[PDB]
Structure formats: C-alpha cells, structure tokens
Symmetry: D6
Subunit: 64 residues, 12 copies
C-alpha cells in the first residue's frame, strides 16, 4: 500500500489522479491550493493534492 507519491510533484491534477487511482483504487482525491489549513481529521481513503496556480501538484501527496 503506498501512502505517498513523491514522483507526482510538478505533474498536473489529471495525471496525478490517474497514478493515485492506479495505486489506490478507493482513493477520494481532494484538490486544495497550497497554503490551505486543514482540520486535523485522518481519513485513510483520502488523498489531498496541494496545487499551484497552474493546478500542478506542488507538494508530495500523502494519504490522510
């Protein structure tokens, strides 16, 4: 089971989605601009994407 996708920094949301879903079929992908403060609630099926102005993944996606 993987929990992080270091190889996705700089890639678009379309192609980060395709990778994560290949590796984590029940993933609930959430797309947030970098800098958003999240409430501390852990979900194992969730994968948050923090994107830049061009909607490219800006940081390492992790489950939570």
């Amino acid at each position: 089971m993987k929990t992080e996708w270091p190889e996705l920094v700089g890639k678009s949301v379309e192609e980060a989605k395709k990778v994560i879903l290949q590796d984590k079929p029940e993933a609930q992908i959430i797309v947030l601009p970098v800098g958003t403060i999240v409430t501390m609630e852990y979900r194992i099926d969730r994968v948050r994407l923090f994107v830049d102005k061009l909607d490219n993944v800006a940081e390492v996606p992790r489950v939570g």
Copy 2:
C-alpha cells in the same frame, strides 16, 4: 437522526445535497471552501459542506 455523513467525502455538492435532504428534510445546506473560519453559533437545521477547488466535499459534513 443522523448528524454526520462520512460517506460523502469526495462526492460533489449536487450529490451530497441529495443525500442530506433525503436524510434531513429541513436541512439548510451551506457550502464553504475548506479553511474558512466560522463563528461559533450552533444550528440544528444547518449542514455545512467544506469543499475543495473542484467543489467536492473535502471533509465530513456534520450538523451545526
């Protein structure tokens, strides 16, 4: 009476609305971007949705 919809994380606002209204007919649904600070005022008939950039429910909806 239900007060939370864990099964709605990742779903769109259209289909989260349909579920909540099935379960909570007098629900007043409020849609806010994740990260918004709310004033601490409890309403039993209110259901706030915290959405991502794609307007998908990002966190567990709860009454309040």
Copy 3:
C-alpha cells in the same frame, strides 16, 4: 423592531433582502463572504449578510 432574522439562514441574498426591507425599511444591506473580519463600528441602520459560495445567507443576519 426586529434586530435579527434567524429564519433567513440558507435563503438567497435576493430573498433575504426582500424580508429585511419589509421589516426594516431604512436598512443598508452589506453582503460579505463568511469569515471576513469587520471593524468594530456599530450602525443601527446596517444589516450585514454573511454568505456562502452560492451567495446563500450562512449565518443569522443582525443589525450593526
């Protein structure tokens, strides 16, 4: 004289306006996104509306 409109949570700005103006003819209605910090200056003729992303009234409108 009324000072609050609890029955307006979840309604649109068009129809919150109509209600307030029926009850408070000299009302100066101000529409702000939820989360905006206001300067502490009291105006008796003012009614601020704090709206969600769909421009629905998110909290209880009060005079001030």
Copy 4:
C-alpha cells in the same frame, strides 16, 4: 435550562463560575482569552468563557 449569561459580562472568572454552576450543575467551564479561534465542535455540557487581560468575562457566555 439556560444557555446564555448576559449578566456575566465584566464579572471575574470566580464569580462567573459560581453563577453558571448554580444554573448548570454539569457545566464544564473552559476559560479562553478573547480572540481564540475554536474548532466547530458542539458540546451541550460545555461553557466557554472568553476573558480579557484581567480575566474578567468579556463576552456573553453561551453553552457549546
């Protein structure tokens, strides 16, 4: 059951405690400096006190 103590603005935490406990025997009193942002979690047995630099109640205490 009361849910608010308007008559406690300006009073000390010692004497706000005594009043609330007279009226709400299972009250869990929480003392926070004014300006603290709280997580939106409703507790019926909780009474938060927002105090000034002199630990005097600065705003109207309410259950939540």
Copy 5:
C-alpha cells in the same frame, strides 16, 4: 472640510465617488474589499472606500 461620509454606507462606489469629489476635489479614491489590512501611512488627500461583494460602501469613508 469634511473628513467623513457616514451618509455613504450602502451606496455604490460610483455614487460615493461623485459625493466625495463634490466635497473634496483633490481626493484620491482607493477601493478595497472590507477586511484588508492597510499599512499605517496617513495621506490627507486620500479617501479609502471599503466595499462589500456587490461593491457597495460597507463602512464609513474617512480621509487618511
């Protein structure tokens, strides 16, 4: 010389401009969303307008 326009709360930026310029011919009108923090620099010829989502004047315009 006037320094404040209490009668402009709720009016649009077009018609607040017309009033201020009638009363203060060298006015440099600056339009900011309510909630913006300004740097503390005093200008006698400046009039800042703090507007709501509908671009209506939300607070009392003052010189500075």
Copy 6:
C-alpha cells in the same frame, strides 16, 4: 451620554477607569491588548480599552 473618550489615549487603565465610571456609572470595562479581534456583538454598557505593553490606553475608548 457620552460614547467616546478621546482624552484618554495615553492614560493608564487605572485612571481611564475612574473617568469612564464617572461618566458612565454602569460601564463594564474590558481591557484587551491592541490588535485583538473581537466578535461583532454590541453592548451598550460595555467599554473596551485597547492597551499597549505598558497598559496605557492606545486607542480611543468607545462604548460597544
């Protein structure tokens, strides 16, 4: 009835208290450090003092 004390900027909290109470016998005086964000709730009997590091009144006290 007075609602503001421009003549109190720079004075200590002890002597601002004495003035306000002379003019406003039922005043509930609240002492907050400058910069504190307050919840928008109007109280006619309340007088908030915004103080500096030396507990001197830093801004013009007003009722609210």
Copy 7:
C-alpha cells in the same frame, strides 16, 4: 483500542494523562493551547491535548 476521550473535556492535564495512559500505554501526550494550528502528520501513538488558560482539556482528545 480507543481513539477518543470525550469524558476528559474540562479535566486537568494531570488527570487526562492518567486516563489516557491507562487506556493507551504507549501514548505520547502533547499539550497545546487551543487555537494552535498543527502540521498534517498522523501518528498513531500520539495524543494531543488542547488546553485552556487553566490547563484544563478544552476539546475532545483524539489519537493522531
């Protein structure tokens, strides 16, 4: 395995510690003032306590 201690709201840090350690022997207890923003990093052995000015547990302790 328990992950939350609803019965600890209002209790002191000394006696919240004793309870958690009875139920979760490898717990790493972290004490933070309410309002602190945490980095989103999940630890199963960690239990964060959010305390008020009197160091009483202010919110429901949860593992993470």
Copy 8:
C-alpha cells in the same frame, strides 16, 4: 535618484509604470494587491506597486 513616488497614489498601473521608467530606467515593476506580506529581501532595481481593486496605486511606491 529617486526612491519614492508620492505623486503616484491614485494613478493607474499604466501610468505609474511610465513615470517610474522615466525616472528609473532599469526598474523591475512588481504589482501586488494591497495587504500582501512580502519576504524581507531588498532589491535596488525593484519597485513594488500595491494596488486597489481597480488596479490604482494605493500607497506610495518605493524602491526595495
């Protein structure tokens, strides 16, 4: 060498650009909304413009 343009408050970005470039031929003009916090890094060839909602210069442009 000039380092500030007090006469540019209220003017548009097009005509502030023309002035600055007349006076400071190697100027790197940066346009930011008023309220943006900048990292403390000094550049002698840079001129930041802090603009209002109408893209009018809101504060005194300075080199840095």
Copy 9:
C-alpha cells in the same frame, strides 16, 4: 515640528521617550511589539513605538 525619529532605531524606550518629549511636548507615547496590526485612526499627538524583545525601538517612530 518633527513627525519622525530615524535616529531612535535601536535605542531603548526610556531614552526614545526623552527625545520625543523634548521635541513634542504633548506626545502620547504608545509602546507596541513589532508586528502588531493597528486600527487605521490618525492622532497627531500620538507617537507609537514598535519594540523588539529587548524593548529597543525597532522601527522609525512617526506621529499618527
């Protein structure tokens, strides 16, 4: 009339006070930690000092 004291950066609050009072006999000196956001209210008789952890003047004192 002077309005700024560039020569006071790095000096203590005791000796900045002595200078300002020599030059501005009716000065109301307010001492705030650097970083404090002030409400935009201009007072000609006020001189705010923004100090570091050692209470040394950190920035250029100005009237306002």
Copy 10:
C-alpha cells in the same frame, strides 16, 4: 549547478521557465502568488516561482 536566479525578478513565468530549464533540466517549476506560506519540505529538483498579479516573477527563484 545553480540554485538561484536573481536575474529573473520581473520577468514573466514563460521566460523564467525557459531559463531555469536551460540551467536545470529536471526542474519541477511551481508557480505561487507572492505571500503563500509553504510547508517546510526541501526538494532539490523543485523551483518555486512567487509571482505578482501580472504573473511576473516577484522574488528571486531558488531551489527547494
């Protein structure tokens, strides 16, 4: 190996991209508005661009 591009302040994102990629072929370019707070995670292959309203590079690009 270069780690900073001082000569790119004021240039557009298109032409900053071309320069960085000439010098750092595996660069993952991330475009963020000035003022965005980033999580402290170091990546050697990443180059963040902090842009103004006109998408011009506002600060010195560095690897990280």
Copy 11:
C-alpha cells in the same frame, strides 16, 4: 546520515538534544513552539525542534 528522528516525539528538549548530537555532531538545534511559520531557507546543519507547552518534542524533528 540521518535526517529525521521519529523516535523523539514526546521526549524533552534535553534528551532530544543528546540524541541528535550523538547522530549529528555539527547540528545547530533550534527550539520553536509548534505553529511557528518559518522562512523557507534550507540549512543542512540545522535541526529544528517544534515543542509543546511542556517543551516536549511535538513533531518529528528533521534537518533543514
């Protein structure tokens, strides 16, 4: 070379120091309260400790 100390969460600053210095003899240990925003500047010899109110390490120490 190690870059992280997962086994130090919950331990005091005295004993986190001893561990890090055993593993990283030239370490420059910096102790910050959890929640502090740092400037994005990478130092290989630096190890920041984010501590709780009891000065216990609250998060995983990493080099940077």
Copy 12:
C-alpha cells in the same frame, strides 16, 4: 562590508552581538522571535536577529 552572518545560526544573542559589532561597528541590533512579520523598510545600519525560545539565532542574520 559584510551583509550576512551564516556562521551565527545557533549561537546566542550575546555572542552574535559581539561578532556583528566587530564587523559592523554602527550596527543597530534588533532581536525578534522567529515568525514576526516586519514592515518593509530598509535600514543599512540595522541587523535583525530572529531567535528561537532559547534566544539562539535561528536564521541567517542580514542587514536591512
């Protein structure tokens, strides 16, 4: 003339002072906790120190 002291990260304020004053005799040293936002005003004779909880220099001191 030096403008930065990379070799001072981790050292105390007493001994950072001694170094800077050896190299920059007219230095006005300002000590601020890490995380403080400064107003963008450049002073060539100023050296700001950003310190941790133990008053150790946490970041690279620079003139400004």
